[PDB]
């Protein structure tokens, strides 16, 4: 669809890891989806699995990072 009437916006998004849109909202959207999906099944193994994936996202919402520098950490 390249033509005299169209344009295209292209963008490098590799630096967008510490950004404010990959923290809280991103995780919480997924949490919400899991809540809906938990109400979209009747078996218990599946709800447990979904709850474990959810709990993984809970733990990933607050995450610290070991980094040495010489001797201290």
């Amino acid at each position: 669809f390249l033509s005299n009437n169209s344009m295209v916006l292209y963008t490098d998004v590799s630096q967008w890891d510490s950004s404010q849109h990959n923290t809280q909202p991103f995780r919480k959207g997924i949490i919400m989806g899991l809540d809906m999906l938990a109400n979209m099944t009747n078996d218990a193994r599946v709800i447990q699995t979904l709850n474990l994936y959810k709990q993984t996202q809970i733990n990933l919402m607050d995450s610290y990072v070991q980094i040495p520098d010489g001797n201290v950490i």
Partner: protein, 795 residues
């Protein structure tokens, strides 16, 4: 080991998250048993002042309000009474036993009981006062509880204001419990399950008539949410659909997949050196999908959720089973483009190539689906009658047992449609394909033989689906409407083929526990639905009968959706709430709420005449009028009729600020009244009377226009006022400008305020009503359908 610590100020992003449930996890309700009797008034000792204003050696009991908390401004007063109505409904009991709350009178002759703790407190207080007549002591000594146990009835004494009697008596005479016997336990179950001999019922208990039970309000959908609330309807539909999937049985012994598929292979005569479209017939013939299709169909047809198809045209068996499907399942139950594509495939690769015709020349938006237009081009009785039946297969909307039902033809249920299907398919097998080669004939005819060698199992399957469908339909309370949903469920025809090729001589019947669980869940949902409607309808119809104009009828609707623990309230918009409101306005109120609100309407003003923080108006007559004698105050500046002087309403002035009128009337000293809720202060002095302060308060209104900082003065004068020697010696009746519009408390008559509250004695209350019934099924091979003929019998 070593550690060094850093942190980082994260944000705090908090969506609403709309905490959900599912239907089996909806807790039903918890009944309200009554606490204390909801008093609004109580007695209270006050001093009393004889005429001439001075004081007795005696006191007197007057009625006063509990919890004087009332606001400033009439709008906020109407808010107060609306909140009060909400509070009463939060305290409106369902049943109540008086003996739990009763206590003992410390001064009764016969050592009897009364109803409440404050009743006995008041009795003891009035007994221990020095300055009460002997007649109330005689009365207090005679007042006791009477019982007649032949009738299971008690009558207890009470002491309470007449409005209080109105409220409590209404609770008594309209508490919704009914006598309980096993016949109602029976008749609570649907007819169709009792009339079905594949379920047997018993119990190991005999409840007495002294027991009780609450009957749910299974009144139907007043709102018609199938009519133009398609998002909510889709939610409800999916949310009932999933519950229905929870209750469809898992299948019994199926034929061995590897053995059956070896048989298919033998009957197909594959080749290891060709592509052979027949090969695609084997796509997805596992278990767990046959069961899934069996589940999807039944839950869809009970929930009235539409469903769409996905199928790769390289697999012809998908089409060959979709034939059977479209016969035995109606067509408006599917979304249009799906079965359009399916019928188009079926036409353009089994039928028109068999009778030697063109492919088709089909329009996208043709008002006829391809089977309808194709019904007339061909000339063969079997296929044409088959297509006629298929095209004219549709539900029957019939009202049974109060609920509407989407019933099948009664020619699909008794499996006979399969004979039409097989006649059409046999008369296609016998044809040649003048246009198409013989290998292609061989492929197609071979495919339909793989399904034709399972005839009896398919007849039984159709009967089984019909049986389970009707049997599960019976455990529904909300009527089941046929209106297409936003969203479908993708059904794969590979799963259908899995079903059609793996089944035999093992019958699945819903267990009675699944049935009763499903029934109680639909009951709880429906009763919650109606009761919450009744809440919101009550408040709305109240609010339109009170001129509550600043109020925005949104949070109520939000509460209505919140108490229904399945919706996403943070992402239902506002217009939809208002449409729900627009329908809710037009509904009748239930009897409880309507009667209580009528009581509150007729007596809210009387409740408001009390509450000595705010007065109901103020007169200003530029003339030295006289003060009125009363005997809980002394000399007061009080008015209680307000005839004569003309009155300005203040909410009209607060709404539309136009102070020219009030200003002109004040400058030129024109007499007036000012109506509206207003605080005051009680100036108990005398030197602040002759100085005439209570006219000074209004000159700020022209200076500062906000009429909210407006506080009249109340000139109560008596022998407890520090300056009463003036009126005694100088012999002057007090006189004052600017009277106040107010009523006095009502004197406490212990005799006439005593009443007898009547109630039952010692019933029991049961909730989980189908817990006393135990239920079981006949052997699944030895089942039987509506036609009195064994299902899952054909071999």
């Amino acid at each position: 080991v070593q550690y060094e610590i850093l942190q980082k100020t994260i944000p705090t992003f908090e969506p609403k998250e709309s905490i959900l449930k599912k239907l089996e996890d909806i807790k039903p309700e918890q009944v309200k048993k009554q606490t204390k009797l909801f008093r609004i008034f109580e007695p209270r000792q006050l001093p009393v002042y004889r005429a001439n204003g001075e004081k007795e050696l005696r006191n007197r009991w007057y009625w006063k309000l509990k919890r004087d908390t009332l606001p400033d401004g009439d709008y906020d007063v109407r808010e107060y009474f609306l909140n009060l109505y909400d509070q009463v409904l939060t305290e409106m009991p369902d049943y109540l036993l008086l003996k739990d709350m009763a206590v003992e009178n410390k001064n009764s002759r016969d050592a009897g009981k009364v109803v409440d703790s404050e009743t006995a407190a008041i009795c003891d207080a009035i007994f221990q006062d020095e300055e009460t007549e002997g007649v109330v002591r005689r009365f207090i000594a005679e007042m006791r509880q009477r019982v007649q146990a032949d009738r299971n009835v008690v009558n207890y004494p009470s002491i309470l204001h007449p409005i209080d009697h109105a409220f409590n008596e209404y609770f008594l005479q309209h508490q919704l419990v009914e006598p309980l016997n096993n016949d109602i336990i029976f008749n609570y179950i649907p007819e169709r399950i009792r009339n079905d001999v594949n379920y047997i019922l018993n119990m190991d208990r005999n409840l007495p008539s002294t027991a009780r039970y609450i009957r749910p309000n299974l009144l139907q959908d007043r709102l018609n949410l199938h009519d133009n609330f398609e998002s909510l309807w889709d939610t409800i539909t999916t949310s009932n659909y999933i519950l229905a999937r929870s209750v469809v049985p898992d299948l019994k012994e199926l034929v061995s997949t590897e053995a059956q598929i070896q048989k298919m292979s033998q009957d197909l005569q594959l080749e290891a050196l060709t592509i052979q479209s027949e090969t695609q017939f084997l796509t997805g013939i596992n278990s767990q999908a046959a069961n899934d299709c069996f589940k999807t169909l039944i839950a869809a047809m009970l929930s009235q959720r539409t469903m769409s198809l996905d199928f790769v045209t390289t697999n012809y068996m998908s089409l060959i089973s979709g034939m059977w499907l479209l016969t035995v399942v109606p067509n408006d139950m599917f979304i249009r483009e799906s079965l359009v594509a399916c019928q188009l495939a079926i036409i353009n690769t089994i039928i028109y190539p068999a009778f030697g015709m063109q492919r088709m020349h089909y329009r996208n938006g043709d008002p006829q689906t391809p089977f309808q237009i194709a019904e007339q081009q061909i000339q063969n009785f079997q296929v044409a009658n088959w297509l006629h039946f298929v095209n004219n297969n549709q539900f029957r909307q019939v009202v049974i047992d109060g609920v509407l039902n989407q019933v099948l033809n009664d020619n699909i249920r008794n499996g006979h449609v399969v004979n039409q299907l097989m006649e059409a398919l046999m008369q296609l097998s016998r044809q040649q394909f003048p246009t198409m080669p013989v290998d292609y004939k061989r492929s197609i005819q071979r495919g339909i033989l793989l399904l034709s060698n399972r005839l009896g199992q398919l007849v039984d399957l159709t009967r089984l689906l019909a049986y389970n469908y009707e049997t599960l339909m019976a455990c529904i309370t909300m009527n089941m409407q046929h209106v297409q949903t936003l969203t479908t469920e993708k059904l794969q025809l590979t799963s259908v083929t899995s079903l059609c090729m793996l089944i035999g001589n093992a019958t699945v019947i819903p267990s009675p526990q699944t049935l009763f669980h499903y029934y109680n869940v639909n009951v709880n949902f429906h009763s919650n639905y109606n009761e919450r409607i009744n809440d919101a309808v009550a408040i709305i119809t109240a609010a339109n009968r009170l001129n509550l104009y600043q109020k925005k009828m949104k949070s109520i609707v939000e509460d209505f959706l919140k108490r229904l623990q399945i919706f996403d309230i943070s992402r239902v918009p506002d217009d939809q709430m208002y449409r729900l409101r627009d329908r809710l306005r037009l509904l009748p109120v239930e009897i409880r709420r309507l009667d209580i609100f009528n009581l509150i309407l007729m007596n809210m003003e009387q409740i408001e005449r009390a509450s000595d923080k705010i007065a109901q108006g103020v007169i200003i007559a530029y003339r030295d009028m006289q003060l009125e004698r009363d005997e809980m105050y002394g000399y007061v500046n009080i008015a209680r009729n307000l005839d004569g002087f003309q009155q300005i309403n203040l909410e009209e002035l607060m709404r539309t600020g136009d102070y020219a009128q009030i200003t002109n009337m004040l400058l030129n000293n024109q007499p007036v009244a000012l109506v509206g809720a207003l605080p005051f202060i009680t100036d108990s002095s005398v030197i602040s009377l002759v100085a005439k302060l209570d006219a000074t308060v209004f000159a700020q209104i022209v200076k500062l226009r906000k009429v909210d900082t407006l506080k009249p003065i109340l000139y109560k004068i008596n022998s407890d006022s520090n300056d009463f020697y003036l009126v005694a010696n100088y012999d002057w009746v007090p006189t004052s400008t600017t009277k106040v519009y107010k009523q006095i408390p009502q004197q406490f008559d212990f005799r006439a305020s005593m009443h007898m509250l009547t109630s039952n004695l010692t019933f029991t209350v049961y909730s989980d009503l189908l817990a006393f019934v135990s239920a079981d099924t006949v052997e699944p091979i030895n089942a039987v359908a509506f036609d009195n003929m064994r299902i899952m019998n054909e071999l």
